[PDB]
Amino acid sequence: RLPKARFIAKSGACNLAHKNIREQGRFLQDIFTTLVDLKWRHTLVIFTMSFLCSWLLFAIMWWLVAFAHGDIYAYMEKGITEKSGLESAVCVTNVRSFTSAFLFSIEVQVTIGFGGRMMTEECPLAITVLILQNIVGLIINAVMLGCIFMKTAQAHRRAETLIFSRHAVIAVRNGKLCFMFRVGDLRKSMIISASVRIQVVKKTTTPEGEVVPIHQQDIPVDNPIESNNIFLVAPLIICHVIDKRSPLYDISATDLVNQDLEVIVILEGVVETTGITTQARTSYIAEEIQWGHRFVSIVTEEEGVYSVDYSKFGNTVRVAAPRCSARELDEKPSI
Amino acid sequence: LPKARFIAKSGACNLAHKNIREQGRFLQDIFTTLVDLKWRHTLVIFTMSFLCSWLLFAIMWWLVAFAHGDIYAYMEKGITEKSGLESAVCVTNVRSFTSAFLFSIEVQVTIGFGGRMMTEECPLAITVLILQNIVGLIINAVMLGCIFMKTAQAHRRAETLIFSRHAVIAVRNGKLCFMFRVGDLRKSMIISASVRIQVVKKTTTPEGEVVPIHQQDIPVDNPIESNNIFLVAPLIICHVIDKRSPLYDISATDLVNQDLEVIVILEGVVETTGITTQARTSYIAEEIQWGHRFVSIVTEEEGVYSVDYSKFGNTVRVAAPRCSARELDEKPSI
Amino acid sequence: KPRIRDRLPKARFIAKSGACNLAHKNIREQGRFLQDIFTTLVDLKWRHTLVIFTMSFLCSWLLFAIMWWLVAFAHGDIYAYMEKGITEKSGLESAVCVTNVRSFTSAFLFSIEVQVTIGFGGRMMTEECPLAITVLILQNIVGLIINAVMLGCIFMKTAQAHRRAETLIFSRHAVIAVRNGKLCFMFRVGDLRKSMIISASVRIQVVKKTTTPEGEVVPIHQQDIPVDNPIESNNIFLVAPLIICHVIDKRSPLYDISATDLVNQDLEVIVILEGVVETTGITTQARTSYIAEEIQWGHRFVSIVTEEEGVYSVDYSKFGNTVRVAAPRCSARELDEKPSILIQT
Amino acid sequence: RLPKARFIAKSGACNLAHKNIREQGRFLQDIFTTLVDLKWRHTLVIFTMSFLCSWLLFAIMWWLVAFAHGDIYAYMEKGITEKSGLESAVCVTNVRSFTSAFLFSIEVQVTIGFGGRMMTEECPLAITVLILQNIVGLIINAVMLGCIFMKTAQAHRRAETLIFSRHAVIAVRNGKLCFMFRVGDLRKSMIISASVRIQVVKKTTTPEGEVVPIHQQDIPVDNPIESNNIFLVAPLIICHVIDKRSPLYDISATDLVNQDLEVIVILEGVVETTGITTQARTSYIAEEIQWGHRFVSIVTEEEGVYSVDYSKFGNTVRVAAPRCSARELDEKPSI
Amino acid sequence: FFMNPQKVKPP
Ligand SMILES: Nc1ncnc2c1ncn2[C@@H]1O[C@H](COP(=O)(O)OP(=O)(O)OP(=O)(O)O)[C@@H](O)[C@H]1O
Ligand SMILES: Nc1ncnc2c1ncn2[C@@H]1O[C@H](COP(=O)(O)OP(=O)(O)OP(=O)(O)O)[C@@H](O)[C@H]1O
Ligand SMILES: Nc1ncnc2c1ncn2[C@@H]1O[C@H](COP(=O)(O)OP(=O)(O)OP(=O)(O)O)[C@@H](O)[C@H]1O
Ligand SMILES: Nc1ncnc2c1ncn2[C@@H]1O[C@H](COP(=O)(O)OP(=O)(O)OP(=O)(O)O)[C@@H](O)[C@H]1O
Ligand SMILES: [K+]
Ligand SMILES: [K+]
């Protein structure tokens, strides 16, 4: 019940499906690659989750370190203020509860250090865990800071916005046929070194056995200097005449109603503000190829300055066209 | 009045993208525009964000040192009437707002003097501490990223490319031309530069379909037909008029009532930064002197070549034929 | 046995894997200036970076702890504290240079407390000994510099994490056949990375030892060959794998070669293709070598794309599978130099 | 002895004047750009001087502030009675001299914050100085971190490493005059999509009575598909066919010596290790082109692995070459 | 020191 498989959906996104793949694995370096690029919703969570985790973990470590040295006994049980004089043997001055260890870990890692919970020189394990906690805190801090700067570097690029018309046409220009779509642009910055390429996708057997299933020929776009470049501010019409060398040369008015054609168009180039290459692609199955229809004039010189009227981006009007073939039209004068 | 031009004499393509569809300003755009600001705003937003965070959390600490009873203890109880605050307050030594502001500054900027120490008596204070701490770190990261992004754009300064306001249609080795002069100010050499020349006019195809504006192209003369070019000194771009060029039937003495425009586009990459760049300009009919040819510049003086911009773009009048290239070719010799 | 003698020597120019196995010699090595080592710090791996990071911080702490220990020693401070005359008699009035620095352990704790901006308050610098203030200034300058350098290292190891490795794949073996009436050279190219490759290009070159009528001989001579495109351009789209064929016309430098003589032929085919990746911004270049011994004549590639239910399927198991369809023999020049019938092909 | 000045010196760095240029003034943007592009021996000086100046200036302000409120003139009188100085509410506890104020600054900006010198809520001027000091400290710290990282990031590239032959050779090839120079390499990663261009620069007239000081006449490097793109992993000989279309037609060895001419060679490509575009140039003068001295083979062929040479890089061996022009070469082209 | 063999499994 499904329609013929399309090579490229209207929103680019070549929908091929590679199977029989020699699946390597992950290498555990994939996680960091994913982490550097997340939607901002998450990178205000993994920040909080990392900081809060590390804090709590080192808090429990301080709790056990103090607990096993007998400090908590000396604080809790012995006299509160007067009946007891500290033996100075304590490991971490004035941390007599878990919450105290939390308010010590925060101090020891966010570099606050209020100074009501000092580090004495008795318990060597305490100094060891202090070195370890400080090192871990710095490593996490640098990684998170670099992640935040990376996700502030990519605030310029948003999305490829280059708009091709819905359905193409085929008309008459200078006594010869053609085939036209309509490219366009939206945002402020122009394109730089823009290029256009037209490929026709077909299943073309050969007289020598080979039958390439999905094979893609390239066809030229009309231009008086044979250069595939284009400089666009208002929408252009990148025509591509048909001739004996061209593959569409055997197309027909009625056969196109049931035919296997696939004219993908790709457009490449950079943008001045971003300074990043980019490209956009689309395809035109036979069902959305009209005939005789030509595109409409869109630019009208108003009183002050030129105006491009997007109101009729893809509107088409019928005009004279012959129902014969390209080879019929070019076969003979009388033809 | 003035007939509109496609692109003005100094970049800045002027048009009217009328009736565009509504995308909707998505929220990420605010950060996007934060990243790229001039420096007479970056320090302002920086300072305002820091001060606002400080003041807001200071007010929060004061409320925490009000709902819990501490200010009453420190105020009403004298030095020795209670003789020491036995019931440890949520935060020690917070008995004002200014004092709470100082405590907030201490906690935010990672100073923590010690007088405004914190005890583990009440939980809400600890929760506020964690909240303010994490928010402060996030703001710190954001502002550091902003300042470093701006630092990374020190080289990217401006655009400098010296075109001319006068195109010359003058004879050269038995043909016509439409030359112009291209300069360069920056000490760098533009790597892999290219030039392009386009012609804009209203057109009517033989089958009656019209195109109001339209970009025809014209080749750039080069003995290898290559759009690459090497602009060290000022150069004289030219576009010879063959029989098949659009300008082949120009109104030689009537370049007034002609609907025409010439566009020049120069592409390159700067070999100091690596940023691609593109400059452009346009010649209307009225700014195209006829018969006038450009002026030689370089004059060797003391074994070092000299280039003077004093006479950069002034042209000397020279007699020349006055007839279309079709009229200068159809006849055997003119 | 005998084959190994022929086997030991092998005139090859770039590795089948892709590296350019060669040898530079007689260079004018003027030296190796210092900054190079610093660059090696940037481009290490995570295990080495973590070790150098933590080791650097710990080394700085220990060194300046020894320094603070000496400073609080020479000022006649450790003894002044050790005098247990009273609970606190001479350690307050005598104005010790640095408060509460009693032993190297304590001095190290102070170094930690002053370098990472901890500031535990129990042991503060004082206004008496200018030497301590000088060493504190030096401490903080070196601390901030080390912090900045290590942050730069870790960040730059983050910003060079988009890359993983090359992902362009070539066929193990070549193929030569007859297509569209004339002899053709084949090779298979495929891609694995989901992100596309924009503005790609390919080049095929013949590497050979040459001769000149004047007499000069270039040992490794390179000459390009066309890539047979319908519009004569080196632009190739990479969605499905394909065969970048090159018609062996008379103008090509493989006219004279024959199918029988292939085993001894000294010519080597090199393929170099390149393009920029869309989602990273880096221009990559992948190169492969086709040695004469690997060019199985007569073979052809099979179809690798079939219509599934609504969407095309593509295989990679049958990727390099070739069928030995019978092919014309030694006709590269024979058929090219067409006989009177000119129908031997 | 006379200079007879060139266009590009043998190492590059086009030595041409630029006179009568209207000034654009300057911008502090230029001071910042100068800062970023510095070298280490000055970064590790400007950074430290910035820090030390910051600390000293804020310490001076702190000392003045503690003077005006009478803090100094108040701690002094407290001889032995601690209460007699504790009673008066000082503005910054335990600052009593310059050195003290210096230490208070150095504890405030770097955020060390010991706390034995505490700040109280008794003097709004102290709060404004604190705010100002902390903001200045953050801005200075951020910009210096930016500079240091920028050096750690862009110290991955070095001076261009390309080697050209000292001399150029006009030789014989395939039965015709020809032009040759040598272009080598020293780095590891091969440049990507390299291109080469050759320009003959000489003062030219124009038969319609117009002169031009320094023309530039691009000329195509020989290749079977006319493609400037060149593979470059071993030293090469970028040839140049000489034709009745090329501006070297009318030069013989007799006329070679005192002839006004030049050749500029510019080649460009993108290094992949640094992912950055670059271009290098050379320039040969008339007297530096040893006629007929054909270039000498370089590379050798060992059994296991090839090998090359650079000691005899620009050795110009001599072989028989005609001492005659190119037009005359086909004027009597018999033998 | 393991083979670490890779085989894909069918839907
Ligand atoms: N104002 C506009 N802004 C942006 N894109 C537009 C606008 N008008 C039309 N388009 C483009 O036209 C394409 C198809 O438009 P859609 O099918 O929604 O309307 P349509 O009139 O049926 O088709 P079309 O607009 O192509 O004639 C879309 O890709 C869209 O981007
Ligand atoms: N000395 C100079 N410095 C910088 N730019 C110059 C200089 N001389 C000319 N230019 C540039 O040349 C362009 C046009 O030069 P032209 O010979 O037409 O003189 P002009 O147009 O009369 O000068 P202006 O536009 O200043 O009146 C201008 O855009 C100008 O920026
Ligand atoms: N299914 C696949 N998935 C991923 N890569 C493949 C696959 N098949 C082949 N390759 C790659 O193609 C290259 C040559 O493959 P080939 O056509 O020789 O298949 P093969 O003979 O199975 O390869 P090998 O002998 O290396 O296993 C190899 O480098 C391999 O990495
Ligand atoms: N052995 C070498 N290794 C690396 N680079 C070299 C070597 N020899 C020369 N070069 C570089 O190539 C350029 C040309 O060197 P060439 O072989 O022509 O020597 P030369 O210039 O004739 O000798 P001299 O330098 O004495 O004039 C030189 O500028 C040099 O920088
Ligand atoms: K701190
Ligand atoms: K970056």
Domain parsing of chain C, residue ranges: 1-22+164-345, 23-163
Write out the H or E segment, with its range, that includes residue A67.
Answer: helix A46-68
Which candidate, C148, B50, B276, B43, places its Cα nearest to that of D28?
Answer: B43
Write out the DSSP string of C15-82.
Answer: -SSS-------S-------TTHHHHHHHT--HHHHHHHHHHHHHHHHHHHHHHHHHHHHHTT-HHHHH
Write out the H or E segment, with its range, that includes residue D47.
Answer: helix D40-68
What does the block give as tokens for A112? 């606050």
Sign of CA dihedral A105, A106, A110, A111: negative
Q: Amino acid identity of A223? A: N
Question: Is B147 touching ligand 2 by the criterion CB < 6 Å?
Answer: no
Give the whole-angstrom CA distance, residue B325 versus residue A311.
Answer: 42
Give the whole-angstrom CA distance, residue A275 versus residue C212.
Answer: 47
User: Tokens 């820091």 identify what position?
Assistant: B50
Q: Are D310 and C25 in contact (CB under 8 A)?
A: yes
Q: Are D131 and D125 in contact (CB under 8 A)?
A: no
Which residues of chain C come before a gap where C and the next N are over 2.5 Å apart? none
Kindly give, in sequence order, each residue whose CB lies less than 8 Å from that of residue A11, ignoring residues fewer than 6 positions away.
Answer: none
Give the whole-angstrom CA distance, residue C149 versus residue B279.
Answer: 39
CA-to-CA dists, residue B211 to A173, A182, A186, A299, B16, angstroms: 12, 13, 21, 8, 17
How many residues are there in chain D? Answer: 335
Nearest CA distance, A21 vs chain E (angstrom) = 8
CA-to-CA dists, residue B76 to B69, B79, B88, B97, angstroms: 11, 10, 16, 17
Rounded to a whole number of angstroms, the distance between the first and last alpha carbons of chain B is 38
Q: Amino acid identity of B185? A: L
Closest ligand relative to B308 C-alpha: 2
Which candidate, C238, C272, C233, C185, places its Cα nearest to that of A218?
Answer: C233
Kindly give, in sequence order, each residue whose CB lies less than 8 Å from that of residue A205, ignoring residues fewer than 6 positions away.
Answer: A211, A212
Give the whole-angstrom CA distance, residue A86 versus residue A78.
Answer: 9
User: What is the CB-side half-sphere exposure of residue A285 using CA atoms within 13 A?
Assistant: 10
What does the block give as tokens for C87? 């609970």
> Can you say whether residue C5 is alpha, beta or left, with left for phi > 0 and alpha for psi between -120 and 50 degrees?
alpha
Distance B314 CA to ligand 2 centre (A): 10
Give B228's strand partners.
B194
Atom of ligand 1 nearest to the CA of B21: 1
Nearest CA distance, A113 vs chain B (angstrom) = 6
How does DSSP classify residue D32?
H
How does DSSP classify residue D125?
H
The two most distant CA atoms of chain C are separated, in Å, by 124
| Chain D residues within 8 angstroms (CB to CB) of chain A | 111, 113-115
Give the whole-angstrom CA distance, residue A306 versus residue B261.
Answer: 14
SS3 percent helix, strand, coil of chain A, rounded to 5, is 30, 20, 50
CA-to-CA dists, residue B172 to A64, B241, C235, D210, D217, angstroms: 93, 11, 38, 9, 16
CA-to-CA dists, residue C75 to C62, C82, C101, C121, C134, angstroms: 20, 14, 12, 21, 14
Which candidate, C73, C72, C60, places its Cα nearest to that of C132?
Answer: C72
**Strand D289-291, strand D168-173: pairing:** parallel
What does the block give as tokens for D320? 């028989």
Kindly give, in sequence order, each residue whose CB lies less than 8 Å from that of residue D43, ignoring residues fewer than 6 positions away.
Answer: D147, D148, D151
Nearest Cα residue in chain D from C282: D275
Atom 14 of ligand 3: nearest residue by CA position = C172
Q: Amino acid identity of B308? A: D
Nearest CA distance, A152 vs chain B (angstrom) = 6
Q: Are C166 and C223 in contact (CB under 8 A)?
A: no
Which candidate, C203, C329, C332, places its Cα nearest to that of C269?
Answer: C203
Give the whole-angstrom CA distance, residue B146 versus residue B144.
Answer: 5
Write out the DSSP string of C201-235.
Answer: EEEEEEEE----SSS---SSEEEEE----TTS---
Give the whole-angstrom CA distance, residue C146 versus residue C63.
Answer: 14
Angle (nearest 5°) at CA B233 between B232 and B237: 95
Nearest Cα residue in chain C from D300: C219
Print burial letters for A48-77: b (CB count within 10 Å at least 16), e (below 16): beebeebbeebbebbbebbeebebbebbee
Distance B275 CA to ligand 2 centre (A): 26
Among B105, B152, B274, the residue with its CB nearest the CB of D276 is B274
Q: Amino acid identity of A145? A: L
Give the whole-angstrom CA distance, residue A256 versus residue D240.
Answer: 52
Give the whole-angstrom CA distance, residue A181 versus residue A315.
Answer: 12
Write out the DSSP string of E1-11.
Answer: -----------
Atom of ligand 1 nearest to the CA of A165: 26
Give the whole-angstrom CA distance, residue C253 versus residue C206.
Answer: 8
Give the whole-angstrom CA distance, residue B145 versus residue D146.
Answer: 9
Give the whole-angstrom CA distance, residue C317 versus residue A167.
Answer: 38
Kindly give, in sequence order, each residue whose CB lies less than 8 Å from that of residue C110, ignoring residues fewer than 6 positions away.
Answer: C65, C68, C98, C101, C123
Please state, as a whole number, how many other Cβ atoms lie within 10 Å of the Cβ of residue A191.
Answer: 20
How does DSSP classify residue C116?
S
Give the whole-angstrom CA distance, residue D182 versus residue D316.
Answer: 11
Q: Amino acid identity of B178? A: F
Give B290's strand partners.
B169
Residue ranges of alpha helices (H) inside C75-173 are 78-82, 104-115, 130-159
| Chain E residues within 8 angstroms (CB to CB) of chain A | 6, 8
Give the whole-angstrom CA distance, residue A46 versus residue A31.
Answer: 13
**Strand C197-208, strand B316-317: pairing:** unpaired
Closest ligand relative to C317 C-alpha: 3
User: What is the CB-side half-sphere exposure of residue B95 using CA atoms within 13 A?
Assistant: 12
> Is A115–D111 a contact, with Cβ atoms under 8 angstroms apart?
no
Write out the H or E segment, with its range, that includes residue A153.
Answer: helix A124-153
Nearest Cα residue in chain D from C158: D153
Give the whole-angstrom CA distance, residue A327 versus residue A243.
Answer: 8
Give B270's strand partners.
B190
Kindly give, in sequence order, each residue whose CB lies less than 8 Å from that of residue A297, ignoring residues fewer than 6 positions away.
Answer: B210, B211, B212
**Strand D289-291, strand A306-309: pairing:** unpaired
Question: Is B311 touching ligand 2 by the criterion CB < 6 Å?
Answer: no
